[PDB]
Design an enzyme around this catalytic site. Structure first.
Site, PDB file in Angstrom:
ATOM      1  CD  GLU A  76     -31.222  -4.528 -76.151  1.00  0.00           C
ATOM      2  OE1 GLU A  76     -30.031  -4.234 -75.934  1.00  0.00           O
ATOM      3  OE2 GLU A  76     -32.042  -3.736 -76.654  1.00  0.00           O
ATOM      4  CG  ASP A  77     -27.162 -11.346 -74.446  1.00  0.00           C
ATOM      5  OD1 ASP A  77     -27.632 -12.421 -74.865  1.00  0.00           O
ATOM      6  OD2 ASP A  77     -26.243 -10.737 -75.031  1.00  0.00           O
ATOM      7  CB  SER A  78     -32.384  -9.303 -69.691  1.00  0.00           C
ATOM      8  OG  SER A  78     -31.710  -8.125 -69.297  1.00  0.00           O
TER       9      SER A  78
END
Ligand SMILES: [Mg+2]
Ligand SMILES: [Zn+2]
Ligand SMILES: [Zn+2]
Ligand SMILES: [Zn+2]
Lengths: 66, 113, 263, 45, 137, 49
Positions: free
Chosen positions: E1-3
RNA sequence: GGUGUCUUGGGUG
């Protein structure tokens, strides 16, 4: 700013090769051949030297203030 | 500002033991070991050493969180053997293997010189 | 039963094939040599006069990243295990850097060779910045113009690469096994044919390629490991390998000690 | 008292809370304090 | 999740490392003929409503010197405002921001258009990437 | 604040009752909150700012 | 022991 001492990815010392790289570029060798001769074989080490922008030359142009 | 110190990974405090053993009561003759201030380097070595003994029936490890420098290891053995004894046996065996490896490397390096 | 076969051996790197050892052993050795072999690096900097364009902690980071000779570092003490209230002559090495540009033309480069060892637990062979040759200039540290000056007293201490990357004796430990994928540990992505589209390993000629009539073997484990240790000059390649082995031995001995003395 | 420096001619000097804010050698308008005398430590990290 | 996972060793070797400069400004006002503020280290006896930070870092001119480590809530510019009609002064000191650390870099001192004293204090610090910093391609 | 304390956790905008939920505390280093990734759907959250 | 108010512009979610 000034050439990093180590390669970010693996840690090889690239800080002692900037002057040799500039001299190699002076005598006509293209960038890949100069990086080959300095024995930078992993592309991480190669992009350390190939993408450096030497800004300390620009910072040194403002007169020392003391 | 919330970053812990980079030496708490390996430096054992005085109030924190290096090793702590508790038994797993669910299955017979099994123990749970918590190693403080260690990581995968020792864990995988010990696990794959212990997995090759005939008398070891279960062995596993995990690092529950990467931000904390410990791992926990579950080790079971057969009826006669004690898991602790198998652990010293594995440690001694790996020590001997590393000593032999060092001797052969030194001999090879001298001939190569 | 373990065997070593050195293929190439020079001062900075050694290329060797390891055999008859478990993959866990080889990977533990790789990790230990990357992370847990102690070296010496500047861990405390004292600025007297810094009138260069670079910032104080910029120069401090660069000085901390300078490789130092660490041959005798194992006969030294960790600065957290010495009774001295402040680093004494025996658990630290003190270096000096003095640089200055005189004249009104040209630029004076400050190199790592200009570092001068003043004290240290003699006659131990630690502390000196590593030179490639007799004529080596070392690492570029800063540049100086008219009246710009640098006066620095650095402290060097014993540490490992877990604490900070500047204590790593190694740059990159190449490591591979099973060049022909006989064990089928990988499963090659392809568009048309997986044999044409994937380059051969550089150790392909060290092992017999699988025959077309051959069937898959479910008893074979990895048994030969090709690894190339490289150093930064702080330690020699054989020294790095042997001290990685010794460090692993002492970690195992620590475990054994705790087990026996918890009884 | 406390050391200053000129902004134009880089002259060093020291003022005593009653002179105006000015340089002696040239008479320039902006001045900078001098670096402290204490010793500063960095972690080199 | 866009980490995104980053190499700690590369951070340790200087990847995505940056300098930060914050500059505080202050001057003396003129409330009348001979009623003005002053840059000066404020003694407790003659001053009131003093800040809860420490004043032990100011030179005799009410200004800190370059090269000194400063933490949050520490005073970097001492100033006093006179009490209109001893113990006849109020303080107008400038603390450091309660969040920021750093090291003083360049304390400038001049006079404004009207000849009153003028001070600019630039702090410096270094920010090393850690969990929660934002990056993009 | 200590481990297992119940705390209310919330992201704006709070479009429905499941944008504000009660969590058990676990103390950790760094200055960022930590969420199990299956609860990012009711919050409509992601980890890009 | 007490760290003030309102608008304009540029962003993050
Ligand atoms: Mg988002
Ligand atoms: Zn590299
Ligand atoms: Zn000591
Ligand atoms: Zn002047």
């Amino acid at each position: 700013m000034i050439i990093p001492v180590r390669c970010f990815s693996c840690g090889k010392v690239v800080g002692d090769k900037w002057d040799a790289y500039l001299r190699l570029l002076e005598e006509g060798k293209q960038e890949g051949d100069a990086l080959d001769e300095l024995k930078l074989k992993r592309y991480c080490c190669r992009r350390m030297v190939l993408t450096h922008v030497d800004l300390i030359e620009k910072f040194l142009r403002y007169n020392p203030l003391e | 500002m919330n970053a812990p110190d980079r030496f708490e990974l390996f430096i054992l405090p005085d109030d924190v033991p290096k090793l702590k053993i508790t038994p797993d009561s669910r299955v017979p003759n099994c123990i749970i070991i918590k190693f403080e201030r260690e990581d995968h380097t020792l864990a995988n070595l010990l696990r794959e050493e212990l997995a090759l003994y005939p008398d070891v029936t279960f062995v596993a490890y995990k690092v529950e969180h990467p931000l904390f420098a410990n791992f926990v290891m579950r080790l079971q053995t057969e009826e006669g053997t004690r898991p602790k004894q198998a652990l010293e046996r594995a440690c001694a065996s790996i020590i001997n293997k590393l000593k032999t490896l060092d001797h052969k490397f030194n001999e090879e390096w001298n001939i190569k010189n | 039963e373990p065997k070593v076969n050195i293929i190439n051996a020079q001062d900075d790197e050694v290329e060797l094939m390891l055999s008859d050892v478990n993959l866990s052993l080889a990977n533990s050795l790789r990790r230990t040599m990357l992370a847990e072999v102690p070296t010496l690096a500047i861990d405390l900097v004292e600025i007297k006069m810094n009138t260069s364009v670079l910032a104080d902690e910029f120069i401090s980071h660069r000085l901390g990243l300078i490789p130092l000779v660490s041959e005798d570092v194992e006969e030294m003490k960790y600065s957290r295990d010495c009774t001295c209230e402040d680093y004494c002559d025996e658990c630290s090495v003190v270096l000096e850097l003095s640089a200055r540009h005189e004249g009104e033309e040209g630029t004076t480069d400050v190199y790592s060779s200009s570092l001068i060892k003043v004290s240290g637990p003699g006659n131990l062979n630690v502390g000196e910045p590593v030179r490639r040759d007799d004529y080596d200039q070392g690492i570029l540290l800063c540049k100086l113009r008219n009246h710009q000056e640098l006066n620095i007293r650095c402290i060097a201490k014993k540490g490992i690469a877990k604490e900070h990357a500047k204590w790593s004796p190694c740059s990159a430990i190449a490591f591979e096994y099973d060049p022909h994928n006989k064990l089928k540990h990988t499963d090659f992505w392809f568009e048309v044919d997986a044999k044409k589209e994937w380059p051969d390993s550089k150790y392909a000629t060290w092992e017999e390629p699988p025959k077309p009539g051959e069937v898959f073997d479910y008893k074979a484990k990895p048994n030969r490991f090709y690894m190339t240790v490289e150093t930064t000059g702080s330690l020699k390649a054989n020294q790095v390998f042997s001290r990685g082995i010794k460090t692993l031995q002492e970690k195992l001995a620590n475990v054994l000690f705790e087990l026996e003395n918890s009884r | 008292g406390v050391k200053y420096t000129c902004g134009a001619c880089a002259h060093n000097f020291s003022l005593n809370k009653s002179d105006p804010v000015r340089c002696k050698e040239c008479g320039h308008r902006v001045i900078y304090k001098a670096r402290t005398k204490r010793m500063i430590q960095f972690d080199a990290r | 999740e866009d980490s995104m996972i980053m190499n700690q060793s590369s951070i340790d070797r200087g990847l995505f490392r940056s300098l930060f400069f914050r500059s505080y400004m202050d001057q003396e006002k003129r409330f009348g003929i001979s009623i003005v503020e002053e840059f000066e280290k404020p003694t407790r006896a003659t001053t009131l409503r003093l800040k809860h930070g420490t004043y032990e870092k100011l030179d005799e001119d009410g200004l800190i010197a370059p090269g000194v480590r400063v933490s949050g809530d520490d005073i970097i510019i001492g100033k006093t405002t006179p009490i209109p009609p001893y113990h006849t002064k109020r303080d107008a000191s400038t603390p450091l921001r309660s969040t920021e650390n750093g090291i003083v870099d360049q304390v400038l001192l001049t006079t404004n258009q009207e000849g009153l004293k003028f001070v600019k204090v630039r702090m410096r610090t270094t920010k090393v990437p850690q969990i929660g910093d934002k990056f993009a391609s | 604040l200590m481990d297992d304390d119940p705390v209310l956790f919330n992201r704006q905008p709070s479009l429905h009752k499941m944008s504000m939920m009660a969590h058990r505390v676990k103390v950790m280093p760094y200055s960022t909150f930590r969420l199990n990734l299956s609860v990012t759907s009711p919050y409509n959250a992601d980890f890009d700012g």
